[PDB]
Amino acid sequence: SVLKAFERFTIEQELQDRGEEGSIPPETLKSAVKVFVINTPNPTTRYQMLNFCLRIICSQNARASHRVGALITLFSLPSAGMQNHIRLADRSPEAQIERCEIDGFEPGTYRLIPNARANLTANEIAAYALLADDLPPTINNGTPYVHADVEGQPCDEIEQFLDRCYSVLIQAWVMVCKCMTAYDQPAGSADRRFAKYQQQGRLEARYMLQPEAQRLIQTAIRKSLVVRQYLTFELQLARRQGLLSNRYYAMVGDIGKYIENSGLTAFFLTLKYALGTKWSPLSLAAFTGELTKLRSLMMLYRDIGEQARYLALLEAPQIMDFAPGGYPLIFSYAMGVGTVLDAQMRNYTYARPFLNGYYFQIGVETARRQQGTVDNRVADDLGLTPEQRTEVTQLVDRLARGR
Amino acid sequence: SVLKAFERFTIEQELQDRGEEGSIPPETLKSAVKVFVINTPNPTTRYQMLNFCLRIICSQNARASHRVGALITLFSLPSAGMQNHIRLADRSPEAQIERCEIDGFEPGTYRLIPNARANLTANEIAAYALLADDLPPTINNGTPYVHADVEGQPCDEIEQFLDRCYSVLIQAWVMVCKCMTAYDQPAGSADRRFAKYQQQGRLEARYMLQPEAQRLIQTAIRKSLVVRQYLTFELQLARRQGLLSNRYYAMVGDIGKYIENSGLTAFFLTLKYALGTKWSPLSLAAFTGELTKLRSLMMLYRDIGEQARYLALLEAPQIMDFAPGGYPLIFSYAMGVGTVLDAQMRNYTYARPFLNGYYFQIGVETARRQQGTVDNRVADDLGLTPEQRTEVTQLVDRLARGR
RNA sequence: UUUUUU
RNA sequence: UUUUUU
RNA sequence: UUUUUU
């Protein structure tokens, strides 16, 4: 009937060439961003570079673009040829890299030596050195390193530098998974994930970061889109990798696994919990108007281009389509099943005003009732007899006590 | 029988070459609209330009065309090369852009310097400067900025300008979604949507707009078709974009998602709620005379050219075809189901005089009765037994209390 | 005719 | 809109 | 996250 037309209509509303678009945007005011490169593998140079960039991260009065450049440098230090990695950042718009080359710091504290190919102004060095010591008062020692001793210690061996740099890089990395989300919340979530890598040994607690620097890195990550684009490509490259790999990319991918779906949490939780745990209510003939939306949304996520696993991290209009408000009722039902099945999900926030309490209570009661609705054509694969089905349901009822 | 002829007839009534017409209209009295361009990326110049345009927005005695030009300039400031964007506005009729070029304001408050290529009259500068301070008495501080301090503060760095300009642009943008609709209503709807972006951080509350300026922008958007055409292309371009994008177009698309279907609300709500939630009544053999109309309307919306998602925003005769009055009875039924299922829809207005109360009450009773009409050939995909169907219906009945 | 919602 | 979890 | 066993 006309229902076929309605279904094709609803899908067509969701296929307005939104998924794949490999085109540039109209040009926009860029930001002159000054970035520095270390061609030689000198470990002392890169160590001083890491310390300098971390200083600039906490530079209180620094220009935003200065923080962007310091961040991009930081994320690019581990690379052998930093020229190539610096090049990749420019592949995105909003990138106007004033790529500079410094063979190394002067024997002064943070005084710099520009190289012949890429030079700068004397006022540049003066302002950068001024920016080198602007540190938050809440931070106790001048260094963000909590141990407050290693920053003084040098390293002339590539191995020691690699360990220190990897540790600091993962320090910064772990904060990404909470970028643009629950920033005002103190570090109640990352420490578990951080401590895991710590006792994995692939992290070092002897070189760790103070919480204030952590939150400053959080702020810088949110404020600067350039670093966001860079983190995207870094992670996209990491995923495509095989088993054998270097230390750094291996760690990056390992953390990125659950870094990815930082958003869509409502969507993923809803889809999983509802459309999987289909006991009683999913067939109601009143959820169709949202099931069509859900199917279209799945098609969207498949045909975005596999980058959708980073939609929240890359603030884009697609989230507005991936919105629970589009499908309030199935959302209510899924929240109902989740608040019963998991224990941690109880700690999750579901304060969307459009939520229908009626369907929410429907979900809760279905979860606490249908526990043990065995009978399926799938169930008969095991071959159990109906007497066995009754036995199973009764056994569930025995432990149903303790509510 | 003849019924085939009737159906083809009714569709043919709806296919009079109404959908796609890439042709110009007969020429009409245009409006000399004076617009200004800033080729250099100077941030102070563009900041002063933004302040000036916002002044002219609230210019009480200004010529309508003056407000049109100020608006178009405002919407075009973020672009790198504003020449190109100014060119696009002229692609529509009713566009007679007196495109002017000003390298920057004079050291006076708002005194202007025209450039050699595009000059004007001295009386032009005099009148524009006079128009610069005409401000509504209801506005407290001279500036529309509620904080009333940043307008004095300068900015010589492109980043600061970009942040300020984006914030102001979204300030203006969010009011578009209510253009030509519920204008007399105070800002009871936009604040939720605005505050969302605010705590998204992509907006800044430190630079926000007073409600009077908001309503003046509303008025200007309604009165001037040129800005409407410009907003259309801006949004049409935004939609076709891919994942990676600049800040500004990303925000524009993100808001435009639900900016789009600003009209057809009756149609979309009706089609969704009725033709989806088909429990009892949809098959009645008395809704056919409107179901044919509905199918034809769906074909119209598909074959308009995907721009139909902006039919209300682009006041066009097609709305008169997309009229509930064409299909009063299915409208009654859908309003009936909606007033039961959603809670917010209760706040919606459905005061069309042609509404049949009988079918409305039919819809209401069907919604409150058929809740839980499980049995479908689709329902059997889950494989539940009729005993399970009775269990589900009874369980719904248990929570049916609380009406 | 247009009036919520996300 | 975004808010756990691994 | 990883923690026996053969």
Encoded tokens for B333: 């039924």
Among B80, B255, B306, the residue with its CB nearest the CB of A28 is B80
CB contact under 8 A, A93 and B245: yes
Q: Which nucleotides of E are covered by protein (CB under 7 A)?
A: 1-2
Query: Residue B153 — φ and ψ, nearest 5°?
Result: -65, 135
Give Cβ neighbours of residue A41 (< 8 Å, ≥ 6 apart). Answer: A80, A158
Interatomic separation, CA of residue A315 and C1' of nucleotide D6, rounded (Å):
24
Encoded tokens for B266: 């009756």
The rounded distance, in Å, linking the Cα atoms of B259 and B110 is: 34
The rounded distance, in Å, linking the Cα atoms of B267 and B323 is: 8
Among B241, B258, B343, the residue with its CB nearest the CB of A356 is B343
Please tell me the distance in Å from B130's CA to the nearest CA on chain A.
Answer: 31
Please tell me the distance in Å from A356's CA to the nearest CA on chain B.
Answer: 8
CB contact under 8 A, A31 and B248: no
Other Cβ atoms within 10 Å of B105 Cβ, number:
18
Looking up tokens 């040129």 gives B226
Helix H, strand E, coil C: the string for B230-266 is HHHHHHHHHHCCCCCCCHHHHHHHHHHHHHHCCCCHH
- Compute the C-alpha angle B372/B373/B378, nearest 5°: 115
Amino acid type, A315: E
Residues 193-222 in A having a C-beta less than 7 A from any atom of strand E are: 195-196, 198-200
- Compute the C-alpha angle B80/B84/B87, nearest 5°: 145
Query: Residue A365 — φ and ψ, nearest 5°?
Result: -65, -40
Helix H, strand E, coil C: the string for A195-223 is HHHHHCCCCCCCCCECHHHHHHHHHHHHH
B293 touches strand C (CB under 7 A): no
Nearest to B301 by CA among B316, B283, B322: B322
* Chain B partners within 8 Å of A225 (Cβ): 247
The rounded distance, in Å, linking the Cα atoms of A154 and B395 is: 71
Q: Could you tell me if A26 and B79 are in contact, meaning their C-beta atoms sit under 8 angstroms apart?
A: yes
Among A28, A31, A288, the residue with its CB nearest the CB of B159 is A31
- Interchain CB contact of B195 with A (< 8 Å): no
Number of Cα atoms under 13 Å in the Cβ half of residue A206: 10
What DSSP letter does each residue of A115-140 carry, written as one string? -SSS---HHHHHHHHHHHS---TT-S
The rounded distance, in Å, linking the Cα atoms of A62 and A219 is: 13
Between chain A and chain B, the number of residue pairs with CB atoms below 8 A apart is 175
Which of B49, B246, B301, B401 to probe by mutation at the A interface, max A CB count within 10 Å?
Answer: B246
What DSSP letter does each residue of A324-389 carry, written as one string? GGGSHHHHHHHHHHHHHH-SGGGGS----TT--HHHHHHHHHHHHHSTT----TTGGGTT--HHHH
Amino acid type, B262: S
Give exposure, B31-66, as e/b (b: 16+ Cβ within 10 Å). Answer: bebbbbbbeeebbebbbbbbbbbbbbbbbeebbebb
- Interchain CB contact of B140 with A (< 8 Å): no
The rounded distance, in Å, linking the Cα atoms of A381 and A370 is: 20
Q: What is the 8-class DSSP label of residue B148?
A: -
Using only C-alpha atoms, what is the Rg of chain A?
26
- Interchain CB contact of B245 with A (< 8 Å): yes
Sign of CA dihedral A3, B288, B300, B173: negative
Interatomic separation, CA of residue B235 and C1' of nucleotide D4, rounded (Å):
36
Q: Could you tell me if B183 and B222 are in contact, meaning their C-beta atoms sit under 8 angstroms apart?
A: yes
What DSSP letter does each residue of A40-98 carry, written as one string? S--HHHHHHHHHHHHHHHT-TT--HHHHHHHHHHHHHTTSSSHHHHHHHHTTSSS-EEE
Measured CA distances, A219 to B71, B207, B260 (Å)? 34, 19, 33
The alpha helices in A261-287, defined as continuous H runs, are: 265-276
State which H helix or E strand residue A282 sits in.
none
Please tell me the distance in Å from B76's CA to the nearest CA on chain A.
Answer: 11
Distance of CA B200 to the CA centre of its chain: 21
Nearest CA in chain A to B238: A25
Q: Could you tell me if B311 and B318 are in contact, meaning their C-beta atoms sit under 8 angstroms apart?
A: yes
Residue A131 exposed, middle or buried by CB count within 10 Å (0-12, 13-18, 19+) = buried
The rounded distance, in Å, linking the Cα atoms of B65 and A167 is: 61
Among B242, B295, B374, the residue with its CB nearest the CB of A285 is B374
Strand order of the β-sheet with A32-37 is A32-37, A96-105, A112-114
Q: Could you tell me if A206 and A160 are in contact, meaning their C-beta atoms sit under 8 angstroms apart?
A: no
Q: What is the 8-class DSSP label of residue B26?
A: P
Amino acid type, A93: P
Q: What is the 8-class DSSP label of residue B97?
A: E
Nearest nucleotide, C1' to the C-alpha of B338? C4
The rounded distance, in Å, linking the Cα atoms of A39 and A83 is: 7
Please tell me the distance in Å from B312's CA to the nearest CA on chain A.
Answer: 17
The resolution, in angstroms to one decimal, equals 4.5
Encoded tokens for A103: 């063979």
Relative to beta strand A96-105, strand A32-37 is parallel
* Chain B partners within 8 Å of A21 (Cβ): 240-243
Measured CA distances, B73 to A61, A213, B211 (Å)? 33, 41, 21
Encoded tokens for A12: 């067509």
Q: Could you tell me if B312 and B263 are in contact, meaning their C-beta atoms sit under 8 angstroms apart?
A: yes
